[PDB]
């Protein structure tokens, strides 16, 4: 199966907002840089810091062509602690459904806002993170394939590498589902894995 | 701390690559990628000597092989090596 280009733009637009939001709600960066805005007919936070926005934009500019071909299993916003050990993970798990369901494009803002609303309140259910947490994005691909790297490597200034064990492993994780939704062509699930003592 | 398939010592890498490019004539990308991972770790671990040797060994063996496959394998391997060099050392490996 294969997602479209416009689906893939939608998804990336969506993830951009979300990554921004997660960063705020978990206090990875201080609130001084965030400015209220409205996407998917709901309020959100978005950094104003230009370096920050470029990083994220760059990250997703690159993921897009892999979403186009539906070559991504998980986009993951990993929050690392002060000693570079993972404390928290926000996983977007993407799937193809095999008809009676909702039309994704017709109902975009309904469907994605749900995700957005849950992230907003998700601090209610997680534990508070340590200070000086930084973050990273990790892309799980469906296949270990060369083409994935050909396609993600679109910005000379912004290379990608294969991550390792260090970047991914979390000790004693706990699972906090936030949202699941199914549609015409795309099923996506958001959930948090947090570290058992953080 | 950079290993190829467990192979850490240089020559253990070098044999292991030789056997790999010598036995196989349609290599699984899984394997190709780990070589790319191996090399970017060499950049991150600050071992440019080894990496410059490794690059070259398999430049020779890969472009020597009759399989065009291996010849494109190398080009891929080096391209990813160079965008990472270019951002870590601000330079690109000189490959004469």
């Amino acid at each position: 199966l294969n997602f479209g280009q416009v689906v893939a733009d939608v998804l990336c637009e969506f993830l951009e907002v979300a990554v921004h939001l997660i960063l705020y709600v978990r206090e990875v960066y201080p609130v001084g840089i965030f400015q209220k805005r409205k996407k998917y007919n709901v309020p959100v936070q978005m950094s104003c810091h230009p370096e920050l926005n470029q990083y994220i934009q760059d990250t997703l500019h690159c993921v897009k062509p892999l979403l186009e071909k539906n070559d991504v299993e998980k986009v993951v916003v990993v929050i690392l602690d002060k000693e570079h050990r993972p404390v928290e993970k926000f996983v977007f798990e993407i799937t193809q459904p095999p008809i009676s369901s909702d039309s994704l494009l017709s109902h975009v803002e309904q469907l994605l806002a749900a995700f957005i609303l849950k992230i907003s309140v998700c601090d209610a259910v997680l534990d508070h993170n340590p200070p000086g947490c930084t973050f990273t994005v990790l892309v799980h691909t469906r296949e270990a394939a060369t083409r994935n790297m050909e396609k993600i490597q679109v910005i000379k200034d912004f290379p990608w590498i294969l991550a390792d064990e260090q970047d991914v492993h979390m000790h004693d994780p706990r699972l906090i589902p936030l949202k699941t939704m199914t549609s015409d062509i795309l099923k996506m699930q958001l959930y948090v894995e947090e570290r058992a003592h953080k | 701390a950079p290993n190829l398939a467990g192979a850490v010592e240089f020559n253990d890498v070098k044999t292991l690559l030789r056997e790999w490019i010598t036995t196989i004539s349609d290599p699984m990308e899984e394997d190709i990628l780990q070589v790319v991972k191996y090399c970017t770790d060499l950049i991150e671990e600050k071992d440019l000597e080894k990496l410059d040797l490794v690059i070259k060994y398999m430049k020779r063996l890969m472009q020597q092989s009759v399989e065009s496959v291996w010849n494109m394998a190398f080009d891929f391997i080096l391209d990813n090596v160079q965008v990472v060099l270019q951002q870590t050392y601000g330079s690109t490996l000189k490959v004469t």
Partner: peptide, 20 residues
């Protein structure tokens, strides 16, 4: 592992933020 990718560049830390 073989099918997980991530950017080489680490994002701007908290410090490099404070001042812009």
């Amino acid at each position: 592992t073989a099918n997980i990718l991530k950017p080489l560049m680490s994002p701007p830390s908290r410090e490099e933020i404070m001042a812009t």
